[PDB]
Amino acid sequence: VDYDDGIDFPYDDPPLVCCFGAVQKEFVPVVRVHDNPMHPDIYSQWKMLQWDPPEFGRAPGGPPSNVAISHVRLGGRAAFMGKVGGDDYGEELVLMMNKERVQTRGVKFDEGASTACTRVKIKFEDGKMKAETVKEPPEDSLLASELNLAVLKE
Amino acid sequence: GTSTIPGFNQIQFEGFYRFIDQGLIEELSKFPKIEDIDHEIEFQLFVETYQLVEPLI
């Protein structure tokens, strides 16, 4: 915007990449309707939909933390930018990213928030049950003042 | 056994259950309605009334 941050350095190799968003365990986002369901209870049949998948789920993606971990395992250097709560689950997620050698210096903690928890209120508009968000989870509550300008520079 | 390794005793388990369902009825039939030479006394079985009770031991 106006100036730079920190101290200029030649920077190490491989070049750093930044993954921005929420850090979650699994949680494939892409969901559509499939016409070939298996038994609702017997999950031992559900592997048959892994080798005959819905087309939208042939190579599913996930949260940016998955991309960061995969990039580091492939020999690259990655940093994750996001916010987690100050509870046990947030520390567990940050530990998972740390053991994978993903840079967590861009991770902001929120002591008053519950990681991966969203407050919603249930309403019955036009005869159908619905929900609306009361308090967003800390993964959706990263502020522009909480960014890490060194990571964004490198 | 479409998606998992089946039980190693499933063939014995399913065979015996088939015998209880259809083997008994199919064999309790063909039992002749026993009649004497004089035809006076006729003995017969009502196969639809067949039952098995759980073992006492």
Q: Kindly list the residues of chain B whose beta carbon comes within 8 Å of any beta carbon in chain A.
A: 2-4
Please report residues of A whose CB lies closer than 8 A to that of B3. Answer: 44-45, 47-48
Which residues of A, range 22-51, sit inside 8 Å of B by Cβ? 44-45, 47-48
Q: How far apart are CA A70 and CA A63, in angstroms?
A: 11
Q: How far does chain A reach from its first CA to its final CA, in angstroms?
A: 16
The single-letter DSSP state of residue B19 is I
Measured CA to CA in angstroms, residue A115 lies from A29, A72, A132, B15, B43 at distances of 18, 24, 19, 53, 80
Please report residues of A whose CB lies closer than 8 A to that of B7. Answer: none
Task: Kindly give, in sequence order, each residue whose CB lies less than 8 Å from that of residue B47, ignoring residues fewer than 6 positions away.
Answer: B25, B28, B29, B31
Q: How far apart are CA A107 and CA A19, in angstroms?
A: 11
Q: How far apart are CA A38 and CA A1, in angstroms?
A: 54
